[PDB]
Amino acid sequence: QFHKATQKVSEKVGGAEGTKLDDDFKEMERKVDVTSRAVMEIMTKTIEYLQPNPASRAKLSMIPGYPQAEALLAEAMLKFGRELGDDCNFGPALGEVGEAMRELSEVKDSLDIEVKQNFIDPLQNLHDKDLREIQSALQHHLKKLEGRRLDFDYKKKRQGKIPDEELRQALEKFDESKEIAESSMFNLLEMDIEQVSQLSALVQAQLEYHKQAVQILQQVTVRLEERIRQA
Amino acid sequence: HKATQKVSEKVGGAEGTKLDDDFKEMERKVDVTSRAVMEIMTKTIEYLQPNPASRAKLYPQAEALLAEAMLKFGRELGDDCNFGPALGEVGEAMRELSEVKDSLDIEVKQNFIDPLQNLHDKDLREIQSALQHHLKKLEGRRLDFDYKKKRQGKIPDEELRQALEKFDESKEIAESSMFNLLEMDIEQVSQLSALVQAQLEYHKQAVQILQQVTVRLEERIRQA
Ligand SMILES: [Ca+2]
Numbered sequence: 110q111f112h113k114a115t116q117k118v119s120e121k122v123g124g125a126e127g128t129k130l131d132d133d134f135k136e137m138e139r140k141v142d143v144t145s146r147a148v149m150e151i152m153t154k155t156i157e158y159l160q161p162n163p164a165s166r167a168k169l170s171m172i173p174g175y176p177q178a179e180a181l182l183a184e185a186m187l188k189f190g191r192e193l194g195d196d197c198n199f200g201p202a203l204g205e206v207g208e209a210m211r212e213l214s215e216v217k218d219s220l221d222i223e224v225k226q227n228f229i230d231p232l233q234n235l236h237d238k239d240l241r242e243i244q245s246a247l248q249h250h251l252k253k254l255e256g257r258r259l260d261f262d263y264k265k266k267r268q269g270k271i272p273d274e275e276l277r278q279a280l281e282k283f284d285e286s287k288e289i290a291e292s293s294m295f296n297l298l299e300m301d302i303e304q305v306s307q308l309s310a311l312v313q314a315q316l317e318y319h320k321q322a323v324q325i326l327q328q329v330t331v332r333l334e335e336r337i338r339q340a
Numbered sequence: 341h342k343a344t345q346k347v348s349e350k351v352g353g354a355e356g357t358k359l360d361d362d363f364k365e366m367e368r369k370v371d372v373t374s375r376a377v378m379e380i381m382t383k384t385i386e387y388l389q390p391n392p393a394s395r396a397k398l399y400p401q402a403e404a405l406l407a408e409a410m411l412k413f414g415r416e417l418g419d420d421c422n423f424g425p426a427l428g429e430v431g432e433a434m435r436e437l438s439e440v441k442d443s444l445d446i447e448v449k450q451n452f453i454d455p456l457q458n459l460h461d462k463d464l465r466e467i468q469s470a471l472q473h474h475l476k477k478l479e480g481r482r483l484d485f486d487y488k489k490k491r492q493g494k495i496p497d498e499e500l501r502q503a504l505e506k507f508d509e510s511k512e513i514a515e516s517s518m519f520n521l522l523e524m525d526i527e528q529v530s531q532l533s534a535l536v537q538a539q540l541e542y543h544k545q546a547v548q549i550l551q552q553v554t555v556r557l558e559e560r561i562r563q564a
Binding site: 140143144146147150151154155157158160161162163165178179181182184185186188189192193197198199202203206209213301302304305306308309311312313315316319320322323326327329330333334336337340 | 402
């Protein structure tokens, strides 16, 4: 029982509240780091999924200015379909499937372009800017919090008693930090849901792509069944 | 020497040249079909596995590595947020797409590529060789007959009969070859049909998988 007010302030800034605020800031900087590494690797695996072919992939990241494997298959079928002639059914059949392959090629183009713009680019920005700036901030605030905490303890050690006016200042600053962490927490809650939204952009793009592959393939399927039946 | 002249006009005339052309046409069709199958088989393989380092068998599917990456980070984030579990949901969706892709590669390989390779290495190669053979034999007899005619003017009725018999054999052999190629022609169209069917089943299964994940994320975003 001595230096009462000083001990209460020391009890908070360096007690429970203090440690909790420090973990909160640490907790958030962890989630940001994970999100950052995640977004980066998922971005890379997505591109590789869109264009497993390295030559065409390098061009994708440029943005399409490259040919789709489907288009190359289409060309092969159409070229030889022509050389075979219409004196048979395989010749014209290669032209019907070759056309479909070229059609698949175009929807594949749209899939690459849409994922590139509505999923890859956004994550690249999220990673290079937003997450990078938030991370530095968390660390910067985490350092200050630790600094003022030490200065306070060291001061209490020297003077024993810290004036009432300086105590409240220390309390105001600690409080300002509690607000900053809370403001970051909510900001992160919003980012968290926006990230799920970006994932939708990816999934929605694939669905549309495949939906169109189906329409294209169901059709050419009819053309072939009929061709065989009518040989 | 009417008799001798009638045979000569057949074997060394229009009908002879028609048969000869019929053989050369099928030969042509075989060469083209042979080269076409090789090229189409190759582009199909490159379409199934665009990444060259992984065309050997035809490594893990690109879809599978993506699913891996999402699940790993999906769990490193935790179940407190929404992104972590979301990645888990979409991750599983990617793995299921990897399963379906696997099937595509397997079914296209089995019902399109191998049949084509077989056709190119066996069937087309045998027919091609047989066509060369009958073609040379056909010309060989046409010449032999022509020089026999020059050598003796009038050719014995029995030798005329043999000449006509051999010519008929080849004429029928060509008729057989024509039909054999007709069989193959429609067979090849069936192979393309098998290719399309496999792709169609793949994309259909992909649609269903994606429709599911779509609803799950739709809901998750709503309850956020
Ligand atoms: Ca006959």
